Amino acid sequence: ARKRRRHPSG
Amino acid sequence: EPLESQYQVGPLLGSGGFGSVYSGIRVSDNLPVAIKHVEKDRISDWGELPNGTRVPMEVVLLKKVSSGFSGVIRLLDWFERPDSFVLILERPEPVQDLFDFITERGALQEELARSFFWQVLEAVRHCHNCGVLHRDIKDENILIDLNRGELKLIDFGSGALLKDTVYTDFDGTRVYSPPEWIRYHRYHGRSAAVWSLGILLYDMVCGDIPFEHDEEIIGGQVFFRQRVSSECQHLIRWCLALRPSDRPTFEEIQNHPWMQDVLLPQETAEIHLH
Ligand SMILES: NC(=O)c1cc2c(-c3ccc(C(=O)NCc4cccc(N)c4)s3)cccc2s1
Structure with a gap:
């Protein structure tokens, strides 16, 4: 249900 | 040539x-x-x-x-x-990155999280022994060899030579970065690495990272969204101590009661990956 996402470096 | x-x-x-x-x-x-x-x-x-x-x-x-x-x-x-x-x-x-693995499987069983986390600790110790600070430890930067049960660190593009003096530069992932970086744009290598490893361990046993916002990183409150043993919660909360000097050494992490009786890589592949 809850949004899991990648996170860019920088 | x-x-x-x-x-x-x-x-x-x-x-x-x-x-x-x-x-x-x-x-x-x-x-x-x-x-x-x-x-x-x-x-x-x-x-x-x-x-x-x-x-x-x-x-x-x-x-x-x-x-x-x-x-x-x-x-x-x-x-x-x-x-x-x-x-x-x-x-x-075959390979899958740990980010995709956790997305597909959800929160990992503690036995599997223990095996993965232990192997990441050994890899990070190897880097430090070689004079290298990764500065971007996260699930996205870990490959799983699915047949051997072996984890491999990637992407040293944000890394530095390891030093004992303060770092005032950072280009890693903000949601794995420590509160002293958020608040003061200063950190020490080892204690910042231990913070990122706390974020990673939470990620493994809960199925996502604990913090998205700066206020959460500096707030010092870890809410468990999944069932996590008291020993595992203790290790995570210790790695995520707000004061860097309150965080465990790598020795104290690997001597922690939660970390004992780790599976071998091949046992990990046979039980959890095959
Ligand atoms: N970067 C690096 O230094 C390295 C990456 C690799 C890789 C891979 C690149 C991405 C991979 C992946 O599984 N996700 C694919 C994927 C999906 C969605 C977004 C992104 N960025 C990637 S596997 C394999 C072997 C050695 C290295 S060294």
């Missing part, structure tokens, strides 16, 4: 802050490789090899950690082009 003929270039695997990474085969022996391209104009951190050749810091750090066997993806070769560097890296097959 030229890159063109020494490797067969396959399709893209991914791109981002790191560069552009293609599947590849070494023709001399059909070894599976990853071919990583970095544009010179995009590289901010430069170093020198023993012979004083000017190279991306990434090549300096990879060469320091790539001697012998470890939980790090090894640099097999590199080439300079007019506008870029090309890095030839190991490619396990």
